[PDB]
């Protein structure tokens, strides 16, 4: 106390600059803060959640305001396919005249940035048409963020702060979130789609001032309560329908076609409204499961404890798990992060193959940017989920209260899990690299026909089972008399089969041996990252090399050079080493996606098919080949609009490289160097009149690892983003 940080009395007495560093890097670790209690911790978490909501609302409001102010929305909606959306204007006093000339695009009056987040297509699809709508949305969101901050402050104050018993009421929270946060929210989204978006995609402009005077359907609500719901699907939009006009428009508000809109190459709006309504019904029904104050429903802990198999193969089953989950907040955070990462990767996988926003499938750079975005974020979320599982093992785990349940039995045979996962990783790596090197050597000797090209026959069979007819497997949906095919011929299969067999979209791309090899590389990456994380978690509480690790915290430098040396023995260090593998695996994923899509967008899928089988093909035909315009963004003969990326491309190369510093050179060298520097400064005239107030010291071991990893990751992300955006946008195809 008595100085920054006030939450740590041990740090505030550190006479070195370390106090500052560790002062910043532990501000949100409430559990390790002095004089910390239960209710204090929960209330702080609650207020921080409110702050995060306010920040999110403010950020999206800023996006809206800038697109409304320096954007291109009114012009973009006139011709979505032949005008580049504008993000925001550039006002940089460092720009030269040619830079100002090169950066003025999109019909603006000055240098501007071309948006690649895809907000234009998204806002267009939902119904926003003019700049006034964007301004109103921005104002509403500013109000919303202010209200979020007000709620946070209000619940900080006494007499409004919830007690701990309230925070741990899991049954009621689950009921409300399932039936309220999820169900009612999706019901409202379906309502908006029926009332605004669907009419907007047919010519009508329904707004606040007239939405009570317009019927969403000619026979509003008559069919709904009478039960004759089919009347809401009786007249769909014709296949010759321009999006925002009434030419070829229908009256159906709910349907289930399954295909794409022929003009926009995206999902039908009516199908989406129907989807949201359906899942809203499901969530509303399913959110009445647990018992609250009304004497009916379920108690979660009883369900858990009743699920114990006879025969004792699972020990005591799930007995005691309710209390270890409800009392351990790190367990909750790990589960939430795991599910969130899975569904973020699901979003990434579904957005490119089943686009929902109009004219986004034709915007190639936006699609690539969004996919890479969501995949990298999903990887980070998964790595974090495993990190917090390890943290739970260290901090909140009670061995005696979890005696012989699934968790304890997981801990007690950790070695079999780790060894078998290691075997899987070894197998995948050995054979994938062996096949790649074999093919590469084969092409080195000029004999491509001697390659080991394995057809991804199982994936092709699955694709055929979905209805694709390019492999001639003749399976469900691709046969003719199968019950599965015959059951849906009148609902969605027409459109679905029309879309899947169409070979200009990304709905189930044709696959070959290159896909087989790269998918096995993906599997190798997943298995090795899981190996590192699982080993770090299960061994967090201690191992043979350090049996008392649980008493040393989640993160610590080492245990000294004794017993052979104990570098990187913490669970934090296991997460640290797993981040590199996560980056590598997501890099392989995005390399594969981007190369396949850039070769498909050129009508040159063959080229990828030939050159993917060997690694030199990846190095030359993808990295070297697609990197000419980017590196030429500026040259001795001038610059163009891509220069900003060419600079960033180099910037990301520098950060990454300086990351190698903190990862290779370690503390002692730097400490001695800083000591001699301190001597020199103290021994010089006119500058010894200036005196430091915190003794300079080299970065901590853990801090140095963290800084090196941060540099590595920032450089990785920046260089790849520059490359991807410049190469896709350089060709715009």
């Amino acid at each position: 106390a008595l100085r920054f940080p006030r939450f740590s009395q041990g740090l505030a007495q550190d006479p070195t600059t370390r106090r500052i560093w560790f002062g910043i890097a532990t501000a949100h670790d409430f559990e390790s803060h002095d004089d910390i209690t239960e209710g204090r911790l929960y209330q702080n978490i609650f207020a921080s959640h409110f702050g995060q909501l306010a920040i999110i609302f403010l950020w999206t409001s800023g996006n809206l305001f800038h697109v409304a102010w320096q954007g291109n929305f009114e012009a973009w909606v006139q011709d979505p396919l032949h005008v580049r959306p504008i993000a925001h204007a550039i006002w940089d006093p460092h720009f030269g005249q040619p830079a100002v000339e090169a950066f003025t695009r999109g019909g603006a009056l000055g240098p501007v940035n071309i948006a690649y987040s895809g907000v234009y297509q998204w806002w267009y699809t939902i119904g926003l048409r003019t700049n006034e709508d964007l301004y109103t949305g921005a104002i509403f969101l500013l109000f919303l963020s202010f209200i979020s901050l007000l709620a946070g402050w209000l619940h900080l104050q006494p007499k409004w702060k919830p007690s701990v018993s309230w925070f741990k009421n899991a049954e009621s929270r689950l009921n409300h979130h399932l039936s309220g946060l999820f169900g009612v929210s999706s019901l409202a989204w379906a309502g908006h789609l029926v009332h605004v978006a669907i009419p907007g995609s047919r010519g009508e402009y329904v707004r606040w001032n007239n939405f009570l005077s317009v019927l969403p359907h000619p026979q509003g609500l008559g069919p709904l309560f009478t039960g004759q719901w089919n009347l809401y699907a009786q007249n769909p939009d014709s296949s010759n329908h321009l999006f925002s006009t009434s030419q070829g428009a229908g009256t159906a508000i709910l349907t289930l076609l399954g295909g794409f809109h022929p003009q926009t190459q995206s999902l039908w709006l009516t199908d989406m409204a129907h989807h949201h309504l359906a899942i809203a019904i499901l969530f509303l029904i399913g959110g009445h499961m647990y018992r609250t104050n009304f004497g009916i429903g379920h108690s979660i802990k009883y369900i858990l404890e009743a699920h114990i198999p006879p025969g004792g193969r699972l020990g005591r089953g799930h007995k005691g798990l309710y209390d270890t989950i409800n009392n351990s907040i790190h367990f909750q955070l790990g589960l939430a992060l795991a599910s969130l990462g899975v569904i973020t990767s699901l979003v990434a996988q579904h957005m490119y193959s089943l686009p929902a926003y109009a004219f986004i499938a034709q915007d190639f750079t936006t699609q690539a940017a969004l996919y890479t975005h969501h995949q990298y974020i999903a990887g980070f979320i998964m790595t974090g989920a495993f990190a917090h599982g390890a943290i739970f093992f260290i901090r909140d785990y009670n061995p005696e209260q979890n005696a012989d349940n699934v968790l304890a039995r997981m801990l007690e045979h950790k070695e079999a899990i780790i060894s078998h996962l290691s075997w899987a990783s070894l197998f995948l790596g050995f054979h994938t690299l062996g096949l790649y090197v074999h093919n590469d050597v084969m092409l080195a000797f000029g004999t491509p026909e001697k390659q080991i090209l394995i057809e991804p026959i199982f994936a092709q069979w699955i694709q055929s089972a979905h209805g694709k007819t390019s492999y001639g497997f003749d399976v469900l949906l691709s046969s003719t008399n199968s019950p599965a095919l015959n059951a849906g011929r009148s609902i969605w299969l027409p459109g679905w089969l029309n879309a899947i067999n169409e070979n200009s979209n990304s709905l189930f791309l044709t696959i070959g041996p290159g896909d087989f090899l790269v998918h096995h590389a993906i599997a190798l990456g997943l298995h090795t990252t899981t190996l590192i994380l699982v080993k770090g978690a299960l061994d967090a509480r201690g191992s043979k090399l350090m049996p008392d690790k649980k008493d040393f915290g989640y993160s610590f430098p080492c245990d000294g050079p004794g017993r052979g040396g104990t570098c990187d023995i913490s669970a934090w260090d296991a997460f640290y080493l797993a981040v590199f593998w996560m980056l590598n695996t997501i890099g392989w994923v995005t390399f594969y996606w981007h190369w396949k899509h850039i070769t498909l967008w050129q009508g040159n899928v063959s080229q990828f098919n030939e050159s993917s089988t060997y690694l030199m093909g990846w190095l030359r035909d993808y990295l070297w080949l697609n990197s000419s315009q980017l590196i030429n963004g500026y040259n001795p003969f001038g610059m163009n609009s891509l220069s900003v990326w060419a600079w960033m491309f180099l910037f990301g190369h520098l950060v990454w490289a300086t990351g190698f510093m903190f990862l290779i050179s370690w503390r002692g060298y730097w400490q001695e160097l800083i000591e001699t520097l301190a001597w020199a400064h103290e021994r010089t005239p006119l500058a010894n009149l200036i005196r430091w107030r915190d003794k300079p010291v080299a970065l901590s071991i853990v801090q140095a690892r963290l800084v090196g990893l941060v540099h590595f990751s920032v450089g990785y992300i920046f260089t790849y983003a520059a490359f991807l955006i410049a190469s896709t946008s350089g060709k715009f195809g």
Binding site: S163, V164, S165, W166, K168, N169, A170, E171, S172, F225, T226, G227, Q228, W229, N230, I285, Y290, R291, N293, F294, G295, I296, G297, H298, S299, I300, K301, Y302, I303, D323, N326, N327, N486, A487, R489, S490, I491
Partner: protein, 97 residues
């Protein structure tokens, strides 16, 4: 076909099933599962005032304890099945043998 007939019949039938057939089974199951509890104490006993069970409106004059909450539950089930019947019977969908 007649929405009122189907809805009323199905709801009354679901209420009959709840009141005369599955009544004792549900009561026994809710008795044995009990109130949700944290660290061995019920939610109210841990200091959560709002976790208190609403003992007022749960009691009924029915001979066996059929109260408001279960009329709501069984009527909701009846209406859900009734509207499923109506929508699916008027949908006109036909699978092919």
């Amino acid at each position: 076909l007649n929405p009122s007939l189907v809805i009323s019949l199905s709801t009354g039938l679901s209420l009959f099933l709840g009141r005369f057939v599955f009544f004792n089974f549900q009561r026994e199951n809710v008795a044995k599962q009990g109130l949700p509890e944290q660290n061995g104490v019920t939610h109210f006993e841990a200091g959560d005032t709002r976790a208190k069970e609403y003992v007022s409106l749960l009691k009924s004059n029915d001979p066996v304890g059929f109260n408001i909450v279960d009329v709501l539950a069984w009527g909701s089930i009846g209406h859900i099945v009734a509207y499923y019947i109506l929508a699916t019977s008027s949908n006109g969908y036909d699978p092919k043998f």
